[model samples]
Target chain A: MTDYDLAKETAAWLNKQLQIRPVLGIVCGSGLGKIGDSLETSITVAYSDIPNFPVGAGSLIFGSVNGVSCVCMKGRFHLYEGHTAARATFPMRVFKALGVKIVVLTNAAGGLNPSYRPGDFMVVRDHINLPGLAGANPLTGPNDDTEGERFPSMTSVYDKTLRKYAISAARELGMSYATHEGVYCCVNGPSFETPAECKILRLMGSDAVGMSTAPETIVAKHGGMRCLAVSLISNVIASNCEEVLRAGEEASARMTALVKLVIEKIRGEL
Target chain B: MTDYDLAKETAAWLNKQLQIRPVLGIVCGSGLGKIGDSLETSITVAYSDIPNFPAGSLIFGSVNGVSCVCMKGRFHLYEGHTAARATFPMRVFKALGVKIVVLTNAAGGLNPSYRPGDFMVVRDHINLPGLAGANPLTGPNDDTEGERFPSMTSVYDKTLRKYAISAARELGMSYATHEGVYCCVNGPSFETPAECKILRLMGSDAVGMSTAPETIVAKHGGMRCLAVSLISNVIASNCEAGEEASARMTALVKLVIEKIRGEL
Candidate 1:
């Protein structure tokens, strides 16, 4: 079956099983799976059970958060996992098929801006798709007009109104640290950056760097969904994977609080 | 057959037809294939005849003019070829017992100081595409080539670059040359003003879509590499692909070939 067919079939199966049309989509990042806890009476579906779904350590949990219908992905895909850019962001199509109009993605990233501290939260203003420029773009193949138009404009991919709502929520929650609006750089990494690579990225206007968000956002925007992405600074500078994971663990609660508040604000807006 | 076996098989076939073992490998880039035209008694092997080679508009020709094996047509990743496939020629050169590899490419100048006709010696490269996992070294390691975890620190061999510089000065072609860092992006389309500005801010003196991955693969295969970029056009300063610039680049490459012949 084609990706479109598989997405439709998965959505049909999901609709039959959960009987809820989630308007908001949440993708929980490394060590930030606590967002799953926010859901009330969630029904978990393993990726292996889904037809044509990429089999991995990830799942789709359909439920409500703050009375807002949503589908929360417990894990996400990465290019480092030997998946194509299209396959890595395949969930966005599935989410779009399931009636999701907005996507909120979160990841743990290295702080590119010197002012950014480890554990600080960032509201992604824009993204630099490094892989996309290299032809790993999810939309490189045949254009399916039913899915999206060919050549979707990338300008203003992160919805301004939604970002403002998220920032306002952060302010209302009395967050001790500032929530920054900055550019995110998406790289494919199983290895952390060398100092030279980090310096170059900083020069490129990237505030935070990670592996996940851009490809997912590209597909979501192509599907006509508004996107808001958050990055928790796992380290001020990239060191090693273990350190990054440890920092993510330490900042999980703080990130969880901010994401939960933003989703609540988005719910109120709707 | 696997990539290794195919490479060996191709090498075996070439060996049966050719009498000389090529010591230097030259990859001719866009508008720079004129160097191959200068080779004396060159025999052409179309990519179609090569077993397991990605059949496209590429060729491997062995000639004695500069005592080097030259590739006239080159493959590009933006043409939807895999990184490994794009760098396949470098492996074939290595299989032919090539020790030194020289790669040339046309690029848009990102540095404000570079002029349209200036030739830039690639001092180092910041591979944005490779870092994003579109690298030629992405797949499983092939021990037959060299070490799997080959350190890319010596990618652009300093010794060969110095020789090229000395030769440029020797030919009185030194006045317009500059040595700078190159940043390679896999672009089939030209960069927008925003992207050019971003690349400039990112410490790139020059930008192009090729060369870096091939250099990475050459280094992985234990070959000393030298790279030069012909500034065909500089974004934000001048952005036109001119026939005049191509002629100048072709002349510059001819000068380098003479220097290589003289050195050999």
Candidate 2:
């Protein structure tokens, strides 16, 4: 079937399964998916089950985190999923169609700053959309003015009100968090960036690098949802970096724990 | 034929048509094709008849416009030509393969500061790599890397010396020209504000996402030549803007005619 038909059908199925007209949505990344398992209640959807949506093709994982009431995405779509950027984020569009307004995003990121460390959580201030400039945007077809204009203003992609609230929550929990804004360079990568490329991004003022978030955030913003990105400090990215996360283990655990905690807190506010 | 085969054939055919080896090559935009044209008793090759080159894609009106001696470029290559940036410019590489360099580029930009219309010659630029990146520059096939991992620092393509001298000379010509740095942004069409915003952060004081010369010029520099960028105007971009579009070669033909005589 055509992608449009699938988007409509998928949107219908998600809205029905969600039951609650959820105001907040969470996309758990890497270790962050653990947040879903502890949710009060959640609904899950396999990406492969969604028509026209390319299922996760890499080492990424996805599942429903809760008991079928409050929805928590254990894992989320990524650009490296062997699909076009548009197809990669169609699920977010489907969520928007279902009236999902607040998107709480999480990712495992390489820390660009000297102070950041593994297991620390960061509140994203801004981003550098390198992939978008290179023509890998999620909005790349006939204008679907249903959500927003072809050239939507991204002056305020991350919602200001939610940012303040999340910061307060982090403080209330006594979590050590960093508030930083920088560019996120996205390339077609199942592979990590070369040292030179990483150094180039450092020169370009990116404080963190990740494979996700940038495209998904753009998609969420276009759909008129408030975007709040939370990066799980998975690794320090470079030397002079305070400490490193256990390559696969620490990043997974902390990302899961913090994302879950944020998801729990977000649900109450929403 | 597939684009790859066409590109290969064209490169071969054009390589055969040579005369002098010009280190510095110029692509005159809009009214600017004349500088390359006036290069004293130069050999010229028409882009159209060249195999694999686009047909009637670039046709400027004046005869003298197509009449450069040292190099042969009648119509600006990018006008309709597809898959020929490395090759089209390599034609320049084929004949004037090496030397010290100067290039006169012209553009029509949306004034980012929303002031000034005369012209802002680019002192530096950004590379969005529209043609070469997608069509020609696939991962494995990127041949002709004369300079391996060429450092953008050493490859200071700005070469503002010639353009500086030309603008000074044009001041002598009383052209009322202004010189400002440009950031090259890539566009098949103009950019929106969000698109423009991203470039603003890319370290571009002036943006124009279209610095095709910077890449080839870097390759030229990789082969050991100094390059210059003669920007056309103040493009609509931020401090991080890549590059911006300028007047097409066809449109600015007349204005460039007067300036080419004094400079280049």
Candidate 3:
């Protein structure tokens, strides 16, 4: 099956099982899957059960978090795991098929901005699609105009209205390490960046660096979905992998709180 | 077949056809094929006949003029070719006893000071595409090629760049030839306005779709390299008309070739 066909089938299957149709989709990143744990009630669907989807330690959590109807992805595809850009971001298309209009993608990234430190959350204002520029883009093949345009202008991929709501929510909570808007640098990595590589990214005006996010965001935008992405700083120094997950965990509560507030705001607006 | 064995087999076939085991390899790039024309006496081998080589408008020309075997038409990643296929010729060069590789490409100048018809000797490169996983070296480690993790720093031999500068000075062709950093982005489509702006801010003096991958592969195969980019157009400004620059680029390349010959 084509990616679109599989997405339709997966959506149909989910619609048959769930009582509530999800309007929002959430992709949880490394050490940040605890967002699903905050759900009051949910049903889990293993990715193996979904036809034409890449298998991973990932599942769909269909649930209501803070009265918001949503599907929370416990894990996601990555290029380092040998998944293609289309496959890594297949779920975003699936979310669109499920009548999802908004996608909130979260990941753990290395902070490239000197002002940032480990455990900070950054709201993506823009991104440098290093892989997409190199031809790993999800929109590489024939364009399905029904989904979106062949050459979509990414100027507004991250919805301004949704972002405003997210920022307001964080401000309302009075969180100390709330969020800052910056460019996210997306690279394919099974290995971490060298010091030289990190310095180069910093010079390019990137604030956070990671393997995920860009593909998903591109796919989401192509599917005509509003995107709001957040990156939790796992490390700042390149090649410094010490206590990355532990640092991510430290910021998890704050991230979860901000996301929950955003979801509530989204639910209220809907 | 493994890339290593294929390279060896291809080298053996070339060795049988030509008496001179080439010590230098030249990859002729876009609008820069005139370098091959400058060769006094040469033997051409069609790529179609080569075993395990990707088909291209490519030829292995044994140039007795400069004692170099040059690949006339280069393959590029933006042409739906794999990174391995794009860099395959470098390995073939190494296998054919070629120790030095010289690469040339026509590019859009990103550095503000650069003008059309300028030749920029590549000092270093920022390979955004390579970092994003479109690299030739992404697959399984081939220890036989070289180190598992080849330190890519300072891969462009400084001495060769100095030679290019000295040659330009001697020729008295002061058309703003420079030495600056190049950024290699994989592009079948030209850079969008936003992309050009981003690259300019990243400190790239020139941008092209090729060269960096080839350089990486050459270094991986333990071959020293010198890369040069001819600014056919400037990205910060509009596309410069090419006829004048093309003529100038051909002349500059011919001069560089003569200098290499003199060095030999």
Each model's TM-score?
Answer: 0.61, 0.60, 0.62
> What is the clash count for each candidate, in the order shown?
0, 60, 0
Worst 10 residues of 1 chain A by lDDT: A238-247
Interface RMSD for model 2 amounts to 6.5
Root-mean-square deviation of each candidate, in angstroms?
7.6, 8.6, 7.4
Instruction: Assess the local accuracy of residue A172 in candidate 1 as a C-alpha lDDT between 0 and 100.
Output: 81
Tens-place lDDT per residue, model 2, B76-143, is: 22222322343344433433343333334444444454333344544445556442243323333334
Question: For model 2, how does the per-residue alpha-carbon lDDT over A182-266 read when each residue is reduced to its tens digit?
Answer: 4444555777877877776676666777888877787778778888888876777765322333455655554555555555555
Tens-digit lDDT string for candidate 1 (A1-270): 657677888898888887679999999988888878788888888888887678667788888887888999999989889898878888889999999998999988888776788778888888887777876877655557777775565656789988887788778867546578888888878788777887777777778889888888888988889999988877776433125566665577777777777788887676
Per-model DockQ: 0.11, 0.07, 0.12
Query: What is the fnat value (0 to 1) for candidate 3?
Result: 0.17
DockQ of candidate 1 (2 decimals): 0.11
DockQ of 3: 0.12
Docking quality of model 1: it rates as incorrect
In model 1, the Cα lDDT at residue B118 comes to 76
Q: What lDDT is reached at residue B153 by model 2?
A: 46
